[PDB]
Amino acid sequence: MSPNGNLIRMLVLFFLESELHEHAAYLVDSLWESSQELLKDWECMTELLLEEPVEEAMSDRQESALIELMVCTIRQAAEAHPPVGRGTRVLTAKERKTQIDDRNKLTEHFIITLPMLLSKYSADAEKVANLLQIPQYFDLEIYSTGRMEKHLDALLKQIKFVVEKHVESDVLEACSKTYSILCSEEYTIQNRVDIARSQLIDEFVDRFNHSVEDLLQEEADDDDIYNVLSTLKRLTSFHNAHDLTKWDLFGNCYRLLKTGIEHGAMPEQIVVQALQCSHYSILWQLVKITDGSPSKEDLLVLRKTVKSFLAVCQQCLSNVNTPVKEQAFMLLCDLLMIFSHQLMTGGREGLQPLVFNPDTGLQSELLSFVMDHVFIDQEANKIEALHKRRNLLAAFSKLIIYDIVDMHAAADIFKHYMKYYNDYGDIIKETLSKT
């Protein structure tokens, strides 16, 4: 109890203080055989985190490590398998019984205590994004069973306060995914969560629409920019996993982008998010059309939308801010792939009107960005910026393979940048072999 408390406290210390475990998941996984009993004392963990001291209080860094360790243990108990990259899969009857009981214990426990945890740590973006990894492991049927509706309300309350207080893509994304999980995985509670969700969306769609109108009718206050950006981030975040097409967000994202192109002066992060939000609106318009039985005008309306947006992402390659150029680029390669001829596969040849072959102008510009932003002359940030330029190349690589761009003009650029490997590589290879 206070014994298990000492062990968990020293465990958080050994993790933080040694460089002997870099990943919490890996430490937990390694101690799992020997210390499963300790590592699932979740009452002890939430107590440490929620109670005030008498004494010796936890530091902010230890609080954070304890949450990350707690969530790793919740995953291991619920999944009953090592974490990704310690895998090698069949459970014994006793492991299956322990998995069921463990899921039951953590579900009953964290349904009650996750609201209290979110409440206390509501400001700390890292901690909240960690704490919201938890409900994905819930046995959601218990929200009915244990007459625990009071605690579902409690969570939705605290998710609302979190979404309202924050703009970090991590946090917003954890809220978005957590609403997804609560909704479409149990009918009893679906109806209640849908209401809390759509109410939350309405409040943000109002704030966004009022902020857009402020910004555009204006010379523009720093408040006008914060208001648009902050509300748009929430809606973009959610628009990935929630179909928000009933709110015409595309229209206002389009105006934000059309204004910034025209008067040249839209803040980079408003352009980037407006781009992402518009893209997510289109993907969702497309899903509703594939699955429905769409009329001729239904298709031709989505066509006009996609053409004006391809045109916006085209013009956005010429914006000064490289984050914009990269977003515009990534969406161009996505969209030109999606609205290729592939679309007409699976007897779906009704969709011909939605196909788009990029013109030469666009292919040339999708060639330039590669030359300018994938192939550049010149710690942690640089291995992250490399994998991104890899994604940007791979994304572009797909348009080459299917001849959506000039597949020859592209290979020439690959010759030009590989030259020093085809001219001196053999000599460099054998030399480095013998050292």
Ligand SMILES: Cc1ccc(CN2CCS(=O)(=O)CC2)cc1
């Ligand atoms: C939102 C936004 C889009 C594009 C630009 C770039 N600007 C317009 C394209 S251009 O070549 O006509 C002159 C440069 C700026 C802002």
